[PDB]
Structure formats: structure tokens, C-alpha cells
């Protein structure tokens, strides 16, 4: 009857200034017709893009959720919306003869963003270990989890979203936790496993403009 792609415009998706790569791809929407407008149709769609496609010298197992906030000049302007690890990476770090320690905090930044950071760490076998299994005791696991939560809170609640994502890009918080927990039980693969945004402040166009450079 009517070809629906003949009435569709293509749009450019832009990453925030925290990433070396700016244009992360293209996206579609039906043209503004009657009640429905194109800009509203592109205002909540989330792009999960591998970090290696965002930064040219980074790891590919880290994915960032970028959500478009507003569209001007047929460019879609995105913001940090979440971070995750690839399923294969997480499944690869879960081995059978070690303890996995997980922690999570709900911590707000200085610009009103409320985040839920998930940290995962694994017990490391020493280079001369003859014992098959390396297990942390329950109090050791509790201390490691407390250190994880404390470090995440210290690393999030004092900076705004920009510096939080800048720390996430090389996972500074995970390396800090791995360093801090070395004297309780040597940890193996410490990562901020997942970041999900619980609530955001009211939209500010100028803040988003300063965000995209």
C-alpha cells in the first residue's frame, strides 16, 4: 500500500564529550506528521555501544548505555545512561574454585544524578598456591564488600556525572578496590560490573550543551 521507509528521516547520534569517538551511528524516525513529531520519537531511545567503539584504546567488554535527551540540527545528543559488561566477559570471570564478592550502592552525584553501581570481585589464587580452592571466609568477604561500598561511595558522591564516567572509562574504581582489598584477600578480577541510573535531575539544555563539549 504505502512504503513506510519512504517517509522516514535518518538522524546522527552523538556521544558525550567524555568519549573520543563522537558519531556513534545513525538512527531512523518517521517524519513529523500531524500529532506525532519526530523529536518526541527520538527522546528516550537508548544506545548500548561498546567502549572500544567510544574510545579507540579501551576494552571492548565494557558497554555504555547512551540515551538521547534532545535533537537539534538532525543530530541526536546522548548522555550517559548506564554501563555494563558483556555477557561473555562476566561468564568468563565466574570460575569454580574461588569466591565471588558482589556489592552495590545507591549513591548520588553532585549534579542530582542518582546511580546504582554494581561491583564484582573474585578471589585470586597465589602464584605458589598448592591448594586447589581459594576461598575467603565470611568475615573477609564482608570486609571486602564494605571496602567496595566505601570506595564506590567515595568515588561517586563527590564528583558529578562527567568525572564519574571519566573514572568509569578505565574503571578506576575497580582498580582502587582491587588495591584496597589486597590486604584482606587478594582479589582477581575487580570491576564496576554495572551502573544503572535510578533518577535524574530536571532536564537542563545548557548542561547538555556543556556536556557535548
Amino acid at each position: 500500500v504505502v512504503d513506510p521507509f519512504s517517509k522516514k528521516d535518518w538522524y546522527d547520534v552523538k556521544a558525550p564529550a567524555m568519549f573520543n569517538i563522537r558519531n556513534i551511528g545513525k538512527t531512523l524516525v518517521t517524519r513529523t506528521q500531524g500529532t506525532k513529531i519526530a523529536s518526541d520519537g527520538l527522546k528516550g531511545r537508548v544506545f548500548e555501544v561498546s567502549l572500544a567503539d567510544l574510545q579507540n584504546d579501551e576494552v571492548a567488554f565494557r558497554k555504555f548505555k547512551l540515551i538521547t535527551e534532545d535533537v537539534q540540527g538532525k543530530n541526536c545528543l546522548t548522555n550517559f545512561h548506564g554501563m555494563d559488561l558483556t555477557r561473555d566477559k562476566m561468564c568468563s570471570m565466574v570460575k569454580k574454585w574461588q569466591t565471588m564478592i558482589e556489592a552495590h550502592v545507591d549513591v548520588k552525584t553532585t549534579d542530582g544524578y542518582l546511580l546504582r553501581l554494581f561491583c564484582v570481585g573474585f578471589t585470586k589464587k597465589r602464584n605458589n598456591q598448592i591448594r586447589k580452592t581459594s576461598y575467603a571466609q565470611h568475615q573477609q568477604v564482608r570486609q571486602i564488600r564494605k571496602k567496595m561500598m566505601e570506595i564506590m561511595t567515595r568515588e561517586v558522591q563527590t564528583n558529578d556525572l562527567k568525572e564519574v564516567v571519566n573514572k568509569l572509562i578505565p574503571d578506576s574504581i575497580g582498580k582502587d578496590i582491587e588495591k584496597a582489598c589486597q590486604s584482606i584477600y587478594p582479589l582477581h578480577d575487580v570491576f564496576v560490573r554495572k551502573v544503572k541510573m535510578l533518577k535524574k535531575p530536571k532536564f537542563e539544555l545548557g548542561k547538555l550543551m556543556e556536556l557535548h563539549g
Binding site: A52, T86, D88, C91, S92, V94, K96
Partner: protein
């Protein structure tokens, strides 16, 4: 007559073990008794590895793997030939197959 000293399961010093579901039939089988296979397989089969590699946008992509933990009841594990019946003497051998 007692066929196995461990009664075909790996439960010592505890009363109850939580059940799981066989991946084939969905039978309720205790976790200690169930036969567990950890399959780490490439998402791209070896026949298709070269064709996917050439069509890759990124050079040196190293394709991801699949991590699936398989739980089996005794009936389905025997039928699938994951385990076989053994002699009265070879039954005691707990060493995994050298492969």
C-alpha cells in the same frame, strides 16, 4: 544390594540438597546427584569462523564464547550418552575423561 557407596549422589554431612531441573526433561533432580556439564563453546562454529572473520568490521576481533551450565537427570544423561554404564570395578573411577 548397595550399588554405590555414595548412593549415586555427592551428599555427605547434610540432610537436604536443593533440587534443580534437568535441561532436557525438566525433571526435579537434586543438585548433588545431578550430572553437570559446563560447555564453553564458540558462538561462531568452526566452519563459519573464516566467513565471519572476513566480514568483520574490526581486524583481530576474537569472537566471543558461549558459557552454558547443563544439568541432567540420570535418565537423560544416560540417553544422551554423556555418561555410560561401567563395570563394577570401573564404576569407582572418579577421574574425568582425559578427552
Amino acid at each position: 544390594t548397595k550399588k554405590r557407596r555414595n548412593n549415586g549422589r555427592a551428599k555427605k554431612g547434610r540432610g537436604h540438597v536443593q533440587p534443580i531441573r534437568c535441561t532436557n526433561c525438566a525433571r526435579c533432580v537434586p543438585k548433588d546427584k545431578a550430572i553437570k556439564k559446563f560447555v564453553i563453546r564458540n558462538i561462531v562454529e568452526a566452519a563459519a569462523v573464516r566467513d565471519i572473520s572476513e566480514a568483520s568490521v574490526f581486524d583481530a576481533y576474537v569472537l566471543p564464547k558461549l558459557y552454558v551450565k547443563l544439568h541432567y537427570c540420570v535418565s537423560c544423561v544416560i540417553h544422551s550418552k554423556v555418561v555410560r554404564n561401567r563395570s563394577r570395578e570401573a564404576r569407582k573411577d572418579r577421574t574425568p575423561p582425559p578427552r
